[model samples]
Target: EVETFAFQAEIAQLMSLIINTFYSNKEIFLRELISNSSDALDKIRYESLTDPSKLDSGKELHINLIPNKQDRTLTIVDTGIGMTKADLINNLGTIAKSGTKAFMEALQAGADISMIGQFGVGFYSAYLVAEKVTVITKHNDDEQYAWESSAGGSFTVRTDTGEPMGRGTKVILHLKEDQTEYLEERRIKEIVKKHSQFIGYPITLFVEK
Candidate 1:
């Protein structure tokens, strides 16, 4: 079922903080994103160890950075454990942990912008530089889905019947005004090495044809 809904306690607070105060260090956005993609890759690989049938034997896991200069967008694609439809709604809509929500609420109450890495809300860091963010994912046992938001009051989710994701997720960030600096090769390479040089999986950049 395709539907739209407003974000809950932690997501709302997290979005507010990102759009308003967290624009200074944009490189960490890539770091958090890559880290998460690795997490998803880890999930699938772990599952395979338990049940080899969980993934296609032919599938090779990797993370790719796709940049578009004309669209002013940066897309991060990963061969990992994609999220189910409900998984997208629940994971992105609210806190997975009640205590993390409480801690987030507490931080929001005090307008504390210094706090980092408290919950699954790290995905919202994209709002730090993107005017809009879209997530296209396909889970092993579910249909492909798209989730999108712009740090607005609400987000929308819809079934993507056009093309199959095959496996994993693709995150597209529509860069905010004056934020196209993320599109450069030198800058992106420097940031990735600085933050994720030691990551388990290969971090690759896709050159436009």
Candidate 2:
């Protein structure tokens, strides 16, 4: 049975901390999203190395940045290892099962910050510039599901009967008033160049003519 659950006490506190601390540089959210995509691709590629048919046979591996001015939305699409329904619940709901306090303690101890790669909540950074975020993903072993949240205290996950992604994920961000620049081609290109130019996967920008 599907039900709505609020964030645990610690989860709420950590989310508040991350949002307040990182909102100043909202553009970094784009880089974090792309980084997550690259990591997903890396996992699938590695899996394919062991078993040739792990992914959708020969599906192309790449990232797509799509901006829709009419909807005031920007969608980041990736042909990568999409998450299962359980993953959607755990990842979007919790802070990776790693207690936020412990995570903070580790950082306070001067641990390498690069360990951000080890933990997952990078997707939440999108809330800085987005009023609402929707994630649609389809993994080979699971049915398509849509996870939606306003970055308030709760999120919803439901089965998506729409056309499947074949494989991978599509993250759509409803840009806030002050964040509309993210829906512009030139601004997006600049951010990509500044932050994700070195990302191993091919990144494509989809702009309306």
TM-score of each: 0.89, 0.86
When superposed on Cα atoms, how far off is each prediction in RMSD? Answer: 2.6, 3.1
lDDT by candidate, in order shown: 0.81, 0.79
Q: How does candidate 2 score on lDDT? A: 0.79
**Once model 1 is optimally superposed onto the true structure by TM-score, how far is the C-alpha of residue 66 displaced, in angstroms?**
0.3
Span of 10 residues, lowest total lDDT, candidate 2: 111-120
lDDT of 1 by residue, 23-59 (tens): 4777778887898899999999999998887787326
For all candidates, what are the clash counts? 0, 0
Error of 1 at 10 (Å): 2.4
Q: Cα lDDT of model 1 overall?
A: 0.81
